[PDB]
Amino acid sequence: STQREYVFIPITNSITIDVKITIGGSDHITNIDERGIHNVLVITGYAVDEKNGRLVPTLDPCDYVKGILVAGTPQQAQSNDFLTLKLPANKLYLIRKKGNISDDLKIYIPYSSPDARNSMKTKPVSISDDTIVNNIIKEVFDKIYNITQKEKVKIEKVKEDIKELFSYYALEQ
Template sequence: MTSGAGWEEQVFLPITNSISSEDNNQIKIGSSVSIEYNQNGQHVSQIDDKGLHNILVLTGYAIDESTGELVPTFDPCDYVKGILISGKILKGNHFKIIGIPSNKLYIIRKKDVHGNITFSLPIKNFNTGTYQVDLRDKVTSFVSLDRDVAKTIVDNVLAKIYAKIYNSLNKEQKDKLYRDVEEIFNYYSIKSLKSNP
């Protein structure tokens, strides 16, 4: 990070049941979103021998797990947690936040984060003139990650984004990372009442 110039452009990757890694430094979220990360990028979220740091909590949003898009719900109790990584959104509508002071973001397990951050997040239907969100017959429900999913996310996604540091961790440190991911990440998922009779 160059002093004063801010971080490289970041993408918010929600850590949920619906992420999977693809070839070519890509991550797929649901059916509609693809993210490309920079293998050697300056990620705001970091891994070290003590676990995962700088996790962003987005309140007032829930995730549509089928499409991978975030939905503004206007309920301050809804939230989605994720990581900020250097990269860009290849596919999917998105919302770009330019130069937000990092101290305005709700970041947990903070370590060495300062200055302004520019990031994008995948969002539902941002391509009409007047933005509309349709919440009829929608509910949000709390979702947590079980140990197996947490392990899969670490082995398939985080291990690739943070390849260099991940490969230097010993078994105990990797176990700590599995536990971190299982314990830290949970979120609200948006669902249609009609599809859950």
């Protein structure tokens, strides 16, 4: 089998501890090559938990979370609370597609209890204060992408996308 985990992209930094193996196989769909980001999955109906941001499953179709699909085992301290599902790679909402995928694949999702003691009133949240992406790139986009700063020298263009191509809905709870 081939397996991936979906890592979010918040303006909070607890993200780099979510995977164990960097490559594992030889197939990463979310790849960046001299134009911008590609094959980023966008889940809908989930709401972030930015204090340890974990996508709480809500019912609002307007709520969404855009993150990248990377091959690796999730933390090797999971599979009891993460959302594990295998889907046939064609019904998956991902934007900026470049190439066709392997027709079926297993996905690990950061998850949580819904916490039904607090009215889940979500909120449209962008990624601004480019210092808050400046760090997470050298945090996430280096332990996920070694290819940056050895093939990517126009890092400004991997800034000018995460600036607006990555939004979500947070819960501020």
